[PDB]
Amino acid sequence: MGVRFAGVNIAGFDFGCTTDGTCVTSKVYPPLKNFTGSNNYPDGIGQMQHFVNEDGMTIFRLPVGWQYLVNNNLGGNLDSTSISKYDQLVQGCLSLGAYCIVDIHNYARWNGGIIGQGGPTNAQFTSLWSQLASKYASQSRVWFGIMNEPHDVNINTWAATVQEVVTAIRNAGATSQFISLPGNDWQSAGAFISDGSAAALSQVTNPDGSTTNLIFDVHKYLDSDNSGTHAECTTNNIDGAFSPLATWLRQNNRQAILTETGGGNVQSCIQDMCQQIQYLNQNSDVYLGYVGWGAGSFDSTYVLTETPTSSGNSWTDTSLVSSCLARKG
Ligand SMILES: [Mg+2]
Ligand SMILES: [Mg+2]
Numbered sequence: 001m002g003v004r005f006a007g008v009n010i011a012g013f014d015f016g017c018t019t020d021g022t023c024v025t026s027k028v029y030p031p032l033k034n035f036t037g038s039n040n041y042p043d044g045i046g047q048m049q050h051f052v053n054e055d056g057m058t059i060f061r062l063p064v065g066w067q068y069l070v071n072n073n074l075g076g077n078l079d080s081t082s083i084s085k086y087d088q089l090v091q092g093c094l095s096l097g098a099y100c101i102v103d104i105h106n107y108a109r110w111n112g113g114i115i116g117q118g119g120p121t122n123a124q125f126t127s128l129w130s131q132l133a134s135k136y137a138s139q140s141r142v143w144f145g146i147m148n149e150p151h152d153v154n155i156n157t158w159a160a161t162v163q164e165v166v167t168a169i170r171n172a173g174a175t176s177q178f179i180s181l182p183g184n185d186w187q188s189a190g191a192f193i194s195d196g197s198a199a200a201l202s203q204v205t206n207p208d209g210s211t212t213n214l215i216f217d218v219h220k221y222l223d224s225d226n227s228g229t230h231a232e233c234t235t236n237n238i239d240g241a242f243s244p245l246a247t248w249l250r251q252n253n254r255q256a257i258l259t260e261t262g263g264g265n266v267q268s269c270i271q272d273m274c275q276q277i278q279y280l281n282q283n284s285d286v287y288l289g290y291v292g293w294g295a296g297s298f299d300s301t302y303v304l305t306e307t308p309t310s311s312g313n314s315w316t317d318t319s320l321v322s323s324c325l326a327r328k329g
Pocket of ligand 1: 049050
């Protein structure tokens with residue numbers, strides 16, 4: 001009676017990342033309360049506990065900068081401090097019984113260079129994922145979010161890169177986990193088929209030749225330019241994106257997850273987001289879940305905030321989360 005996974009992005013390890021793939025590591029603001037000893041960074045783990053206990057959520061996405069994980073050492077070993085801090089957020093998510101999406105928030109780029117297309121080589125990128133897969137191989141509820149919002153890349157070359165990553169993840173022993181396949185056009189669900197991403201990514205397989213647990217990863221916003229930067233919503237995305245996608249998915253016996261979606265905490269979005277979510281829930285054979293953007297280190301002033309408010313051991317949700325994303329039933 002609905003998609004399997006409902007949850008939210010717990011952002012902050014990605015603050016300082018821009019759409020060119022530059023992540024300034026000094027600017028991260030991770031949602032771990034005691035990240036520095038001040039004990040007053042945003043309380044991502046406390047948020048997740050509320051989301052799971054009160055709002056029936058079962059998945060969280062944890063955006064993080066590539067540069068952060070390797071401390072700016074392209075192709076290097078994961079930095080022991082960085083991975084130690086990030087893993088605290090990962091384990092907090094997993095401890096709640098949720099699935100946890102590790103999301104490399106890099107737009108298929110490193111400091112302006114496109115992975116495998118002038119920027120880092122495929123090997124420098126698979127090296128990142130091989131290490132993460134090795135770390136998380138024994139934890140089946142870690143979900144490998146290969147890349148956030150590739151855009152303006154050669155989709156044929158990108159699909160090959162994605163294939164190399166999937167191979168690396170499986171060969172490292174992470175054989176049980178879900179793996180995301182992200183396409184072009186900022187992962188837009190609306191362009192996923194028409195821009196050729198669906199076809200190219202459909203060719204990616206596990207070592208055994210199957211496509212088992214390889215899930216198409218799309219994004220879609222509800223404002224006029226599909227940017228998620230305006231408060232008001234202007235579409236429920238059904239005719240333009242999710243109906244054609246459902247049909248395609250179903251005919252091909254494949255599945256997709258919507259890892260970013262959101263809107264203002266206003267009436268237009270309460271209406272449109274609920275229509276969108278309802279359609280996903282009525283097509284839960286092909287849609288595995290939805291993940292709202294965004295909570296974690298975002299606060300009450302962020303236009304798409306989904307961060308709950310703590311008041312005397314009580315949390316209160318934003319209106320869009322409470323009215324549309326939450327599952328209190
Ligand atoms: Mg609680
Ligand atoms: Mg677009």
